[PDB]
Each structure stands twice: as C-alpha cells, then as structure tokens.
Amino acid sequence: VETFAFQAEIAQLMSLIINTFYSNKEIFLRELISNSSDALDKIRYESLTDPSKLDSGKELHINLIPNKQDRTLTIVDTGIGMTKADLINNLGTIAKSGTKAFMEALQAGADISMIGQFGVGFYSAYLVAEKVTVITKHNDDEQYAWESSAGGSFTVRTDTGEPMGRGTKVILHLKEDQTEYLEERRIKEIVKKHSQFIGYPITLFVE
Numbered sequence: 001v002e003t004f005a006f007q008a009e010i011a012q013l014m015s016l017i018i019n020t021f022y023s024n025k026e027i028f029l030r031e032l033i034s035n036s037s038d039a040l041d042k043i044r045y046e047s048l049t050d051p052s053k054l055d056s057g058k059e060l061h062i063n064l065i066p067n068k069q070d071r072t073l074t075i076v077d078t079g080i081g082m083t084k085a086d087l088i089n090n091l092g093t094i095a096k097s098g099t100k101a102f103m104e105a106l107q108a109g110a111d112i113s114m115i116g117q118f119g120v121g122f123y124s125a126y127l128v129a130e131k132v133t134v135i136t137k138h139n140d141d142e143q144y145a146w147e148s149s150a151g152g153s154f155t156v157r158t159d160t161g162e163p164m165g166r167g168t169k170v171i172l173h174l175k176e177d178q179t180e181y182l183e184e185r186r187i188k189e190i191v192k193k194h195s196q197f198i199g200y201p202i203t204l205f206v207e
C-alpha cells in the first residue's frame with residue numbers, strides 16, 4: 001500500500017467541499033455518472049479502430065448498487081478504466097487548473113453544483129461520503145484500488161479482490177446522515193432529475 005499527498009490545491013478543494021454549508025448534495029451522483037459516461041465514450045471510440053479492446057467486455061453500461069449493510073453506494077462502469085499513472089499523477093495534474101478555476105468562480109458567485117463545469121466533479125463525492133474507494137482496470141494494466149478519506153492523502157495498491165474485467169467502480173462509504181442515497185426511490189429520483197439522457201444503460205439495483 002502506497003500513500004500519496006494530494007496536490008495542495010486538491011486538498012484545498014476537498015476541504016471546501018467538506019466544510020462549506022451547502023444543502024444540494026444530490027448532485028454528486030450526476031458528477032460520478034458523468035465521469036463514467038466520459039470513460040465509456042472513450043473505450044467506445046477506441047473500439048472502433050481496435051475491436052480487440054472490447055475483449056475485456058463488450059457491454060458498455062453503468063450499474064448503481066446500494067448496500068445498506070455496508071452503508072455503500074457503488075457506481076460501476078465498464079469504461080476505459082484508469083492506469084496507475086492516471087491515479088497517482090495525471091488526473092491530479094489535470095485537476096489543478098480546473099480546481100483553480102472553480103475556486104475563483106465560487107468567489108465570484110458560482111455554487112458547488114457547478115463543479116462539473118470545471119472538470120473536477122469527482123470530488124463532489126465528498127459531499128456524501130466519509131471515504132471513497134475506487135477499483136479500476138484498464139486493458140494491458142493491472143487492477144488498482146485507490147482510496148481516500150480526505151485529510152490530504154490517498155492510497156493506491158494493486159487490487160487482489162474480485163477481478164473486474166475493465167472499467168471503474170466507485171464505492172461511496174456514506175456519511176451516517178446521508179443514508180437517503182441508499183433508498184431506491186431517492187436514487188431513481190436523482191437519476192431522472194440530473195442524468196436522464198446519459199447514452200448508456202443505467203441499472204439501479206435494489207436490495
């Protein structure tokens with residue numbers, strides 16, 4: 001297990017997300033689904049010139065899986081998946097500029113729901129999760145587990161859990177007062193409100 005420091009700007013963003021009073025938390029789901037959609041777009045595009053990239057799974061879709069026992073909401077996609085370099089360096093590098101822009105926009109009257117317009121929507125997960133665990137698998141690379149409870153650091157390890165195939169699984173360990181996001185009616189409502197036209201099937205599992 002390797003432990004890494006977030007870039008200072010990203011740690012600042014995470015603290016803002018955790019500390020700011022902001023009631024419209026439900027937008028976290030749209031942001032995560034948007035990320036899944038982007039990843040699905042990419043594997044779809046690449047498969048057009050190299051069909052063998054779908055050897056790790058032809059189905060392009062998103063599953064939403066609530067588990068009341070574990071107090072988790074999991075967002076699973078069969079997108080392109082992330083490499084170790086994505087997790088440690090490259091997505092953070094990209095997030096720096098977006099974070100800066102978002103912070104500045106907030107100072108000028110934007111609100112937290114607009115986070116995705118700055119390309120850093122993943123971090124909205126921390127509106128509802130005390131810890132986020134991300135399992136990801138890119139073709140020709142190993143399966144990784146990324147994890148953070150904020151506080152300025154994250155971990156990455158090679159994952160020996162159940163093999164995924166290809167894609168990304170975001171496991172939201174929900175805060176004690178945010179269990180509404182385990183309820184079928186609530187998740188359905190949010191998907192219809194904010195993610196109605198996503199171009200991949202979204203299956204909401206029930207318990």
Ligand SMILES: COc1ccc(-c2c(-c3cc(-c4ccc(C)c5ncccc45)c(O)cc3O)noc2NC(C)=O)cc1
Binds near residue numbers: 032036039079091
């Ligand atoms: C908005 O920027 C991105 C969106 C999706 C992805 C992504 C993902 C993916 C990442 C995330 C994601 C998960 C976890 C973290 C820390 C992320 N940080 C920045 C951007 C995305 C992150 C996710 O929630 C779902 C996803 O399907 N899997 O392969 C990907 N690769 C390509 C080039 O897009 C990467 C960047």
